Amino acid sequence: EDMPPEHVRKIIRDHKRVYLGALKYMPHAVLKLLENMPMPWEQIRDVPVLYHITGAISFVNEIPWVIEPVYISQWGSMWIMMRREKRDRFKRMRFPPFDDEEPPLDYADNILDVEPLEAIQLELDPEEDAPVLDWFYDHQPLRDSRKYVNGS
């Protein structure tokens, strides 16, 4: 079974035939990282992670399954909200922000206890959008309901 995050956090923080062979599958880890990027209406996303005993490589180990009409409806909601936001409001982000000589930022000291901002969500009026109001902005909606989705 699984393992608490503090162990693998210590593994990545403090750190050779067994070590050298695990770096062969690095672009596969790049692909598994890039196919699971969070949607504009999500704030956080938890994923499982496989990792080596010494922190050689880290995978994401999950296929991003969505329900297709829900997915098209959510992106149409984002489309309407972003049109509304540009007709209302612009500073494009300065690219690569973190400089060349400084290491990438530690997660445990700077993001771990900082609460995130608000995401991009539509209003969803409670009279007409009543069949969709309880599940429209979850990560995997209706996952734990036996009546709509077959299981986990």
């Binding site: 162990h7 593994i11 403090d14």
Partner: protein
């Protein structure tokens, strides 16, 4: 036919590589004779063996003490990974979990692989032997 290094009449030294950001040519025909060669009439031919073609290059604690610490941090009939699960279940004891992970890394780095699936009695017999 080919020209030697004696048919140049006046090569000199190679003192400085650059100044002011401008690369200095070393005034000798050594590197041109390394890259290619000359004929009798002074034309230059270049060698063409650059297979890879390299598109960026063209334009530039004792182990017994570790065992005693693990026997301190293990209850009997339990593996090390199970002790990690129990201490990490914020965890209950972050400090002893951190200590157990540090002892595990210090035993992995000494060549002992697979220390996570190790029971208390087997580590006690390892310390005894």
């Amino acid at each position: 036919d080919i020209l030697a290094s004696e048919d140049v009449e006046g090569q000199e030294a190679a003192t400085l590589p650059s100044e002011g950001g401008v690369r200095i040519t070393p005034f000798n025909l050594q590197e041109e004779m390394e890259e290619g060669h000359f004929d009798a009439d002074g034309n230059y031919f270049l060698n063409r063996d650059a297979q890879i073609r390299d598109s960026w290059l063209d334009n530039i604690m004792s182990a017994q003490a570790l065992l005693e610490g693990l026997l301190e941090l293990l209850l009997p009939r339990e593996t090390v990974a199970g002790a990690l699960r129990r201490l990490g279940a914020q965890p209950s004891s972050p400090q002893r979990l951190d200590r157990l992970s540090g002892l595990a890394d210090q035993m992995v780095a000494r060549g002992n692989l697979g220390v996570y699936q190790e029971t208390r009695e087997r580590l006690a017999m390892r310390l005894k032997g």
